[PDB]
């Protein structure tokens, strides 16, 4: 899965920012959130989020939903490595399994239940 953030900032610079931010906010996990390709859904003003490690994915759904102004009638799916993470998992658990080598967790969001559809 492609992230514009990774295309626009090179790896070394991302990695050195990730080191600084894990040290500054050790209790929080750094999350890059981006709209999935071909998604038909509100745009997200900002990509970079610091979130408590014990926040659940379900709770993160609520936070993102509100920022894109979705009615609870509308659907929202997260993807991490092309896979919908469990709603009950915590962002800390996601980070440990799926952080990337720049120390960031990458989450794509979409209105469709399959990434890239």
């Amino acid at each position: 899965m492609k992230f514009v953030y990774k295309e626009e900032h090179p790896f070394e610079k991302r990695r050195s920012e990730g080191e600084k931010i894990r040290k500054k906010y050790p209790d929080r996990v750094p999350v890059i959130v981006e709209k999935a390709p071909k998604a038909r859904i509100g745009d997200l003003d900002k990509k970079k989020y610091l979130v408590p490690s014990d926040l659940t994915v379900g709770q993160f759904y609520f936070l993102i939903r509100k920022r894109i102004h979705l009615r609870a009638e509308d659907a929202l799916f997260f993807f991490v490595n092309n896979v919908i993470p469990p709603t009950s998992a915590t962002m800390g658990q996601l980070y440990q399994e799926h952080h990337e080598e720049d120390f960031f967790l990458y989450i794509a969001y979409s209105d469709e239940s399959v990434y890239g559809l």
Binding site: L50, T56, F62
Partner: peptide, 18 residues
């Protein structure tokens, strides 16, 4: 370029509606 550090109340609102 700056990070969104979600506030303790918006976190608390999310823990309620969940």
């Amino acid at each position: 370029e700056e990070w969104v550090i979600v506030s303790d109340e918006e976190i608390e609102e999310a823990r309620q509606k969940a």
